[PDB]
Amino acid sequence: SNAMALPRITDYPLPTAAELPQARGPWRPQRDRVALLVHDMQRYFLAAFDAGNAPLRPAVDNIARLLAHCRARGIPVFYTAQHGDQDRRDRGLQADLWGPGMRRSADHEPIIDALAPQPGEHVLVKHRYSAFQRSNLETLMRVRGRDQLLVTGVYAHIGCTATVVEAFQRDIEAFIAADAVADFSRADHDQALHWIARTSGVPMTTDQLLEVL
Ligand SMILES: [Cl-]
Ligand code: NA
Ligand code: NA
Ligand code: NA
Ligand code: NA
Ligand code: NA
Ligand code: NA
Ligand code: NA
């Protein structure tokens, strides 16, 4: 594999509740206001991790717990997925960092089986780091009365961070599942949660989120 030019991501432990940064914001998530986002959990982006070890194994198990939780409560579920064989003119500047992108292949495009979307769940075409850019995420959420977003997926310091700060700027309170995201390293993972906590959102563990939603 070579997504993000990484043949492999070395194993690292997910942060525990005691290791989370203090959120500057007072926002707390509510079942009737929140929407779940599963950010780019496609075979292409996950190949580099050892799926039997941390962080991916527990992160995938945690997104599966959040999907089951939302499906039992009518909480809207959104996924982002890029399409393969993007034209460089549409892919833009990210191609200068991460190459031409995934191919139109069953080894790249599909959301992994363990997190497969169900009928009635929105799968948005992902064009940029932020799930809101070149999409209708904001209007889909608004007309459903959802003004809170719970972010899960990969990579924490890139698309998850860009999506959180855009949600915040669009008046959508932003939450990130600290152990239902994964990244290039624990250092990148910690950096993402620390920056979100001081500027635009609230990192919480999956166990904490399941208890309050
Ligand atoms: Cl846009
Ligand atoms: Na490999
Ligand atoms: Na609240
Ligand atoms: Na409702
Ligand atoms: Na793998
Ligand atoms: Na691999
Ligand atoms: Na838009
Ligand atoms: Na509860």
Q: What residues are labeled active site?
A: 40
Q: Which residue type does 162 have?
A: A
> How remote is the CA of residue 185 from the centroid of ligand 8, in Å?
32
Contacts of 40 (CB under 8 A, 6+ apart): 80, 81, 82, 126, 153, 154, 155, 159
Residue entry with tokens 């363990």: 114
**Which DSSP string corresponds to 139-179?**
HHHHTTT--EEEEEEE-IIIIIHHHHHHHHHTT-EEEEEEE
Resolution, rounded to a tenth of an Å? Answer: 1.8
Judge contact between 34 and 75, C-beta under 8 A.
Answer: yes
> How remote is the CA of residue 65 from the centroid of ligand 5, in Å?
21
- With H, G, I as helix, E, B as strand and everything else as coil, classify residue 35: strand
| Nearest-10 Cα torsion for 131, 161, 86, 137 | 0
Number of neighbouring beta carbons within 10 Å of residue 2? 10
> How remote is the CA of residue 142 from the centroid of ligand 5, in Å?
37
Residue entry with tokens 């203090």: 22
Among all bound ligands, the one having the nearest atom to the CA of 73 is 4
Residue entry with tokens 């007072």: 26
Number of neighbouring beta carbons within 10 Å of residue 166? 21
First to last CA, the chain: 37
The method of structure determination was X-ray
CA–CA separation, 8 and 30 (whole Å):
37
Q: Which residue type does 120 have?
A: G
